[PDB]
Design a protein around this ligand. Structure first.
Ligand SMILES: [Pt+4]
Ligand SMILES: [Pt+4]
Ligand SMILES: [Pt+4]
Ligand SMILES: [Pt+4]
Length: 129
Protein backbone atom coordinates (compact mmCIF):
# COMPACT_ATOMS: atom_id res chain seq x y z
CA UNK A 1 0.00 0.00 0.00
CA UNK A 2 1.15 3.55 -0.79
CA UNK A 3 0.12 5.81 2.10
CA UNK A 4 -0.90 9.44 1.83
CA UNK A 5 1.18 11.76 4.02
CA UNK A 6 -1.66 12.61 6.48
CA UNK A 7 -3.04 9.06 6.43
CA UNK A 8 0.35 7.74 7.53
CA UNK A 9 0.79 10.48 10.17
CA UNK A 10 -2.58 9.36 11.61
CA UNK A 11 -1.70 5.66 11.58
CA UNK A 12 1.72 6.33 13.22
CA UNK A 13 0.11 8.52 15.86
CA UNK A 14 -2.48 5.80 16.61
CA UNK A 15 0.32 3.26 17.01
CA UNK A 16 2.10 5.44 19.61
CA UNK A 17 4.99 6.93 17.61
CA UNK A 18 4.26 10.66 18.29
CA UNK A 19 7.03 11.63 20.71
CA UNK A 20 8.23 8.04 21.12
CA UNK A 21 11.71 8.39 22.75
CA UNK A 22 11.41 12.15 22.19
CA UNK A 23 10.91 12.10 18.38
CA UNK A 24 7.90 14.12 17.28
CA UNK A 25 5.57 12.68 14.63
CA UNK A 26 7.02 14.79 11.88
CA UNK A 27 10.38 12.95 12.26
CA UNK A 28 8.74 9.54 11.65
CA UNK A 29 6.73 10.77 8.61
CA UNK A 30 9.85 12.41 7.09
CA UNK A 31 11.88 9.17 7.58
CA UNK A 32 9.13 7.11 5.91
CA UNK A 33 8.93 9.57 2.96
CA UNK A 34 12.63 9.29 2.17
CA UNK A 35 13.12 5.63 3.09
CA UNK A 36 10.26 4.14 1.09
CA UNK A 37 8.24 7.01 -0.41
CA UNK A 38 5.38 5.83 1.82
CA UNK A 39 5.20 2.39 0.07
CA UNK A 40 4.85 -0.51 2.45
CA UNK A 41 6.16 -2.89 -0.27
CA UNK A 42 9.59 -1.22 -0.75
CA UNK A 43 12.60 -3.52 -0.65
CA UNK A 44 16.26 -2.63 -1.29
CA UNK A 45 19.27 -4.92 -1.34
CA UNK A 46 22.47 -3.78 0.49
CA UNK A 47 26.06 -4.46 -0.61
CA UNK A 48 26.63 -6.83 2.32
CA UNK A 49 23.78 -9.11 1.12
CA UNK A 50 21.26 -7.92 3.71
CA UNK A 51 17.93 -6.38 2.53
CA UNK A 52 15.84 -3.44 3.80
CA UNK A 53 12.05 -3.96 4.06
CA UNK A 54 8.92 -1.86 4.20
CA UNK A 55 7.88 1.64 5.04
CA UNK A 56 10.85 2.24 7.35
CA UNK A 57 13.33 0.07 5.45
CA UNK A 58 14.22 -2.11 8.40
CA UNK A 59 17.33 -4.21 7.78
CA UNK A 60 17.59 -8.07 7.75
CA UNK A 61 21.17 -8.08 9.21
CA UNK A 62 19.77 -7.31 12.67
CA UNK A 63 16.05 -6.98 12.87
CA UNK A 64 14.11 -9.59 10.91
CA UNK A 65 14.51 -13.00 9.33
CA UNK A 66 14.46 -13.33 5.50
CA UNK A 67 16.11 -16.74 5.24
CA UNK A 68 18.95 -15.32 3.17
CA UNK A 69 21.17 -13.14 5.39
CA UNK A 70 23.77 -15.54 6.86
CA UNK A 71 24.53 -14.58 10.51
CA UNK A 72 21.48 -12.16 10.75
CA UNK A 73 20.12 -11.72 14.30
CA UNK A 74 16.27 -11.37 14.04
CA UNK A 75 15.94 -8.96 16.97
CA UNK A 76 12.31 -8.07 16.24
CA UNK A 77 11.43 -11.78 16.00
CA UNK A 78 9.49 -11.52 12.79
CA UNK A 79 9.75 -12.68 9.21
CA UNK A 80 10.91 -9.64 7.15
CA UNK A 81 7.86 -10.19 4.90
CA UNK A 82 5.66 -9.19 7.83
CA UNK A 83 7.17 -5.72 7.38
CA UNK A 84 5.67 -5.32 3.91
CA UNK A 85 2.03 -5.54 5.05
CA UNK A 86 -0.53 -2.75 4.50
CA UNK A 87 -1.01 -2.88 8.27
CA UNK A 88 2.01 -0.99 9.69
CA UNK A 89 1.77 -2.57 13.15
CA UNK A 90 4.82 -4.89 12.72
CA UNK A 91 7.00 -2.12 11.26
CA UNK A 92 6.02 0.26 14.06
CA UNK A 93 6.70 -2.28 16.81
CA UNK A 94 10.09 -3.11 15.31
CA UNK A 95 10.98 0.61 14.78
CA UNK A 96 10.30 1.18 18.50
CA UNK A 97 12.96 -1.43 19.37
CA UNK A 98 15.41 0.08 16.85
CA UNK A 99 15.10 3.67 18.07
CA UNK A 100 15.59 2.44 21.68
CA UNK A 101 18.94 0.79 20.79
CA UNK A 102 21.18 3.73 21.71
CA UNK A 103 21.52 5.66 18.46
CA UNK A 104 17.96 7.05 18.30
CA UNK A 105 16.76 7.84 14.76
CA UNK A 106 20.35 8.00 13.45
CA UNK A 107 19.84 4.29 12.70
CA UNK A 108 17.93 5.55 9.60
CA UNK A 109 20.43 6.98 7.14
CA UNK A 110 17.81 9.02 5.22
CA UNK A 111 16.55 10.53 8.49
CA UNK A 112 20.09 11.63 9.41
CA UNK A 113 20.78 13.09 5.97
CA UNK A 114 17.41 14.51 4.99
CA UNK A 115 15.25 15.08 8.09
CA UNK A 116 17.55 15.71 11.05
CA UNK A 117 17.65 19.40 11.90
CA UNK A 118 15.03 20.37 9.29
CA UNK A 119 11.60 21.75 10.11
CA UNK A 120 10.01 18.28 10.41
CA UNK A 121 6.63 19.73 11.55
CA UNK A 122 5.99 20.59 7.92
CA UNK A 123 5.38 16.84 7.35
CA UNK A 124 2.23 16.86 9.49
CA UNK A 125 1.04 20.35 8.50
CA UNK A 126 -2.62 20.43 7.55
CA UNK A 127 -3.41 16.92 8.77
CA UNK A 128 -6.39 16.05 10.91
CA UNK A 129 -4.72 14.29 13.87
PT1 LIG B 1 -2.97 -2.71 -3.00
PT1 LIG C 1 -3.20 0.68 11.71
PT1 LIG D 1 -6.45 4.58 10.65
PT1 LIG E 1 18.91 -15.38 7.78
Amino acid sequence: KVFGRCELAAAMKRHGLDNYRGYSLGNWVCAAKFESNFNTQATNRNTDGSTDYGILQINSRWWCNDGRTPGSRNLCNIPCSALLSSDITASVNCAKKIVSDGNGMNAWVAWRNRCKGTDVQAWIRGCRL
